[PDB]
Amino acid sequence: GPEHEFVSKFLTLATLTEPKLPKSYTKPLKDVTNLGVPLPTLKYKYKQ
Amino acid sequence: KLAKTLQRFENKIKAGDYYEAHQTLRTIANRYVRSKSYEHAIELISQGALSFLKAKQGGSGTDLIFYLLEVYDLAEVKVDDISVARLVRLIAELDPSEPNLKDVITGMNNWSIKFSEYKFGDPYLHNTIGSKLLEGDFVYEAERYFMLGTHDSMIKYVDLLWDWLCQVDDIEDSTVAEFFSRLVFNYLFISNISFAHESKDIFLERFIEKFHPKYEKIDKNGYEIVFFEDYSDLNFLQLLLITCQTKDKSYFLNLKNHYLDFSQAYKSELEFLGQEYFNIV
Numbered sequence: 120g121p122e123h124e125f126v127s128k129f130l131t132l133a134t135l136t137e138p139k140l141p142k143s144y145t146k147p148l149k150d151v152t153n154l155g156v157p158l159p160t161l162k163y164k165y166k167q
Numbered sequence: 168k169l170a171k172t173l174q175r176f177e178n179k180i181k182a183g184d185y186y187e188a189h190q191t192l193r194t195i196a197n198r199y200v201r202s203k204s205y206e207h208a209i210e211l212i213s214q215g216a217l218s219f220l221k222a223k224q225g226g227s228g229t230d231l232i233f234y235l236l237e238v239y240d241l242a243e244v245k246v247d248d249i250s251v252a253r254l255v256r257l258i259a260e261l262d263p264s265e266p267n268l269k270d271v272i273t274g275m276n277n278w279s280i281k282f283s284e285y286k287f288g289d290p291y292l293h294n295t296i297g298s299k300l301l302e303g304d305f306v307y308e309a310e311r312y313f314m315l316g317t318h319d320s321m322i323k324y325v326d327l328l329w330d331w332l333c334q335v336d337d338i339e340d341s342t343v344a345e346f347f348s349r350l351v352f353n354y355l356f357i358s359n360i361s362f363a364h365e366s367k368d369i370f371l372e373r374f375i376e377k378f379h380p381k382y383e384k385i386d387k388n389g390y391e392i393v394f395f396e397d398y399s400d401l402n403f404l405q406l407l408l409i410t411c412q413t414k415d416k417s418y419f420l421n422l423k424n425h426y427l428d429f430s431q432a433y434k435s436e437l438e439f440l441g442q443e444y445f446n447i448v
């Protein structure tokens with residue numbers, strides 16, 4: 120309920136003006152130097 | 168001469184004299200290397216490795232692959248369609264159960280890093296070795312390579328996570344989020360916004376079809392958010408994408424203020440995104 124209202128308004132304002140980075144934005148892979156931070160492991164093992 | 172050498176080699180392979188075939192090929196290859204006839208060495212070693220692998224002699228096959236990679240380094244072989252093609256061809260013959268499968272793959276990726284403009288390796292090669300690693304049960308490495316791969320890799324990455332999720336027989340919001348968030352964070356980290364949106368769509372589309380959760384689509388100015396009534400984490404994660412796109416500190420702060428818990432669970436990731444997209448130290 121209230122969450123729906125927040126998400127809807129947030130999205131409306133976040134896109135009021137066109138975002139600095141468009142949806143089609145792609146930093147050339149050859150220019151990537153940092154992969155960010157390690158993500159945690161999934162809390163389950165993988166079954167092959 | 169080389170053709171004759173290969174003929175004798177293949178003959179020994181067919182007769183099952185693997186030891187002799189292996190020993191003689193390395194001796195002749197050694198000679199080409201000493202003569203600095205690297206192209207001759209590469210052709211001999213490459214065909215030799217392929218022959219052993221097709222004959223199910225993994226030990227001798229991988230041994231020659233390592234030899235091939237060392238000469239690639241020695242000869243300063245640049246990463247391109249031809250040099251990569253030889254490796255892709257060998258990978259197709261590698262049994263996912265080879266004891267040293269991982270080391271062979273690492274050697275290939277390392278060479279592509281060293282002789283290309285890609286700090287983390289060639290994306291085309293990544294698409295191929297990523298699938299081989301998955302087959303060999305090296306799931307986190309497969310993920311990393313697919314993340315650093317091509318568009319086809321993005322599709323394979325979504326399949327990996329989707330299939331994994333369906334494996335754990337658990338659809339708690341926290342669990343579905345553990346899988347979904349990896350697509351969102353990884354593509355945000357390497358700034359491939361288009362891949363983030365596509366993978367996101369495929370994953371959510373599939374989740375909807377499979378489990379039929381309660382939801383309502385919210386569309387604004389060409390953007391869409393699938394509001395889940397019982398998957399608040401998924402709502403938060405979808406909003407992250409648009410927020411980083413805006414690079415607006417205010418929205419970032421507003422989003423986190425509304426999702427306090429999730430902001431704590433993803434504290435480390437959000438801190439990185441804070442500096443990456445909002446210039447927040």
Ligand SMILES: [Hg+2]
Nearest residue numbers: 407410411440
């Ligand atoms: Hg964000």
